[PDB]
Amino acid sequence: TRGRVIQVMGPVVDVKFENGHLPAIYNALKIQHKARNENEVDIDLTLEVALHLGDDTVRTIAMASTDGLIRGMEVIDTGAPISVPVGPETLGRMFDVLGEPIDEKGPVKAKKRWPIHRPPPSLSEQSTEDEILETGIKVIDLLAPIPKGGKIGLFGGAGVGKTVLIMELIRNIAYEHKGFSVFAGVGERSREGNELWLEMKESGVLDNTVLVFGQMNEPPGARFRVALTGLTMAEYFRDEEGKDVLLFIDNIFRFAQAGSEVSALLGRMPSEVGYQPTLATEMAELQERITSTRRGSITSVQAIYVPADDLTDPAPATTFAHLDATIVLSRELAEKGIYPAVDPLQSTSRIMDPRIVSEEHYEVARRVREILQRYKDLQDIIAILGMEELSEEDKLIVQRARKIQRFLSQPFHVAEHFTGRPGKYVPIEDTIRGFKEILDGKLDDVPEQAFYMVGTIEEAVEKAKKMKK
């Protein structure tokens, strides 16, 4: 009981099963062909079922290029979804969308395989304990603390600092955490994945890590299913072994975009801004699985691409309801050379509650947002009226806000080539202590140029002495 290819429409393919024994939705199909004559080409392809049509026909999405496919070929039904290898034998390896090794270390001998599509945990077995997870980054550790066991979202447009922030978090959190780590490069540059793999090989961190790729040059079918392959591997460490795990994902927007690219060819009516009529449903089936249960916790850091610096686009707008902490990166700070470019007004987390953080942490964080919010509205006026026309309280707020905004900057270890500086780590007590002296006016005498790419507040005074002031 086999099937035949009937229509080849770029990434989408149609298959007819004459016996009446059709494959279920999401099942995996195989096309393995040997060329009969000199005109044909050998083919090796996997396709997943997406929809049941009327005349014994099924629509399927291919996971690789459809070039060389001929109408009337033979299709085999595997009888189950895309099944990926799971266990401790996946540690220190690199994988494809189908869970096959993309490194040259040989086959994986894991005794079990799990389907990438699985029902999410139920309300009756979730957990929600609250504690502060340190990053060593001045902005995140103060204004938007990371919840252990919670989802973190880094939002930004093209070239604002998202991947340079993910890489610094992996080199800080994972380097200060016992337990497994997982990374999924969803629709990103294959040059960045190579550099990450080499950094891991050098440091020795691959022994506790798993990597999944399926990059930009792959068809739409692979670009949306990659996040599920990385997730079925992080779930085994939580549910079967009981260990805590970190899941890092770059460009979750490519998963939303890839779903939109194949939606029109399947026959679905279009929706707002050219997205599929099932956007919220497809992001929920991904995000609802990355949660902390009674057995173990998945802490998750995700990078979100904002198409034109407009947070109102359907994919970024649909994402905001699922996070526990959200950090927004603005090109306005990046163009001024203030990196990591985190917006101190739009950044927030589930942990900025007076019952969870220390008293002075809560006071300093709320005072920073008020002085910067006051300065934001006043700087616009200065461009038309001139700084000479404003009052002494306004002049004082302008002078302090400039210094606060610059002290939020820090040199990352992964940014040595871009900064010409070695990189620095700042603990939470120093972040709170440093911002308090600026708010209280202790350093009103120090020049505003003594806070760019610095670390601890003691360095600003030493740097001012080197500047001969």
């Binding site: 000199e38 005109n39 496919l69 040059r191 739409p220």
Partner: protein
């Protein structure tokens, strides 16, 4: 292997039969014209025509070639002007190439690559010091029409004569008079001895404008697989995207953002991911890329621009208001970045300007503040003076490139602050006068920097002693 045409119109056709055709195959009409099969419905094949279609009639026979889309490759293409297909368009006879390769190929995998660590010298002060490019990197040139996008790409190709590099220029949707003027500019400067020109002009069938960048890529990767470095320029990917919208709407494929199809990101991702620096196991070869984009009214926020900016390893933005106000080349430092920047430079350039982009951003911001603040503290005066001098040192006229050994000597003097007393209008004359004096009095420094490719302490004293001889002539 045979069919009959049922519909003909606008460079697109529909055929009946052709049961064994493969997705992406080549097909021939009775007229002798070629076409590519891009759709395979249950009863009809959808064919894209690769030439003039006014001779193809309904009921005519169409035959299966038995081959996928293929282009000829080799060293013999150097110094020649060619079509999107394997056909010459210059008055110089046949090509006589040795082998043929497919137009569609998968990009190098994560393990086949190596990090980028060697420079692609543009000879332009702002790009080499602030936005460095390395061999294997993908860099984007972007702005509105009449801003200098073609001048930066050709100045870069002209600067590759000394180095063992092969250049490819792909013209998509360009006017024939400009292609002839580009080819003659390349011949005057001697660049035709190491370059290939692939052209698909505006009046060419849209189907050939689609294939032009992929065929230009297939010719570039051939040198990269052997071990040699290569560069590819794409004159307008925005014109390639506009071209892609037509056949997809004529084949009746549904629209998306703007009126462009859903495959628009995948179009430029399939193309730009083939550019890489390979590992020592693969032979260490390198395929660099320079795509170009045109954006209406100088706005970055649009469908085709944002897709390509999200694919490349950096971008160079050109602004018309900078151009009309005397800043040439008109590159905005705030919006332009290199994702490989710092590793793609020689040690002397990192020592001299590893922090220049961040410093030139403090000054760019201070301009907007100072013009309305009316108060300038000593630390702000010192940065305004230094920032003005650095913005003048970065200006550069056309067809006069700077070798790296001269670029690290002027930027060393500027960043160390020796140009403090020199008036703003005087900096231009000081740069030209000082660079000519270096090529006269004790040229040992200029030659020693070129061999070592690093600035040591001897080369610092040798240079600090030289900068003080010329300044002794001032007030």
């Amino acid at each position: 292997d045979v069919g009959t045409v049922i519909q003909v119109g606008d460079g697109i056709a529909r055929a009946h039969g052709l049961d064994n055709v493969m997705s992406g195959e080549l097909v021939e009409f009775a007229n002798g014209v070629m076409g590519m099969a891009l759709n395979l419905e249950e009863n009809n094949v959808g064919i894209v025509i690769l030439g003039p279609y006014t001779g193809i009639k309904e009921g005519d026979e169409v035959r299966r070639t038995g081959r996928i889309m293929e282009v000829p490759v080799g060293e013999e293409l150097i110094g020649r002007v060619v079509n999107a297909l394997g056909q010459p368009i210059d008055g110089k006879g046949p090509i006589n190439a040795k082998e043929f390769r497919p137009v569609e190929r998968k990009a190098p995998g994560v393990v086949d690559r190596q990090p980028v660590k060697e420079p692609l010298q543009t000879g332009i002060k702002a790009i080499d010091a602030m936005i460095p490019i390395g061999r294997g990197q993908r860099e984007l040139i972007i702005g509105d029409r009449q801003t200098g996008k073609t001048a930066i790409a050709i100045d870069t190709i002209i600067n590759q004569k000394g180095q063992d590099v092969i250049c490819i220029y792909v013209a998509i949707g360009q006017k024939q008079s400009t292609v002839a003027q580009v080819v003659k500019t390349l011949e005057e400067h001697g660049a035709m001895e190491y370059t290939i020109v692939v052209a698909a002009t505006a009046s060419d069938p849209a189907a050939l404008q689609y294939i032009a960048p992929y065929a230009g890529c297939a010719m570039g990767e051939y040198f990269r697989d052997k071990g040699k470095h290569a560069l590819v320029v794409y004159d307008d990917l925005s014109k390639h995207a506009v071209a892609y919208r037509q056949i997809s709407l004529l084949l009746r494929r549904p629209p998306g953002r703007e009126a462009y199809p859903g495959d628009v990101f995948y179009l430029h991702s399939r193309l730009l991911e083939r550019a890489a620096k390979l590992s020592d196991e693969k032979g260490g070869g390198s395929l660099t890329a320079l795509p170009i984009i045109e954006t209406q009214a100088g706005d970055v926020s649009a469908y085709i621009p944002t897709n390509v900016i999200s694919i490349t390893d950096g971008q160079i933005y050109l602004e018309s208001d900078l151009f009309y106000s005397g800043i040439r080349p008109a590159i905005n430092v705030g919006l332009s970045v290199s994702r490989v920047g710092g590793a793609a430079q020689i040690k002397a350039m990192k020592q001299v300007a590893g922090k220049l982009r961040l410093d030139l951003a403090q000054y760019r911001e201070l301009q907007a503040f100072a013009q309305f603040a009316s108060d300038l503290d000593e630390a702000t005066r010192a940065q305004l003076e230094r920032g003005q001098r650095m913005t003048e040192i970065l200006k550069q006229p056309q067809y006069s490139p700077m070798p790296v050994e001269k670029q690290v000597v002027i930027i060393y003097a500027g960043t160390n602050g020796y140009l403090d007393d020199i008036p703003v209008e005087k900096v231009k004359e000081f740069e030209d006068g000082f660079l000519e004096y270096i090529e006269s009095k004790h040229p040992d420094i200029l030659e020693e920097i070129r061999e070592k490719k690093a600035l040591d302490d001897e080369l610092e004293e040798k240079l600090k002693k030289a900068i003080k001889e010329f300044k002794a002539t001032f007030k």
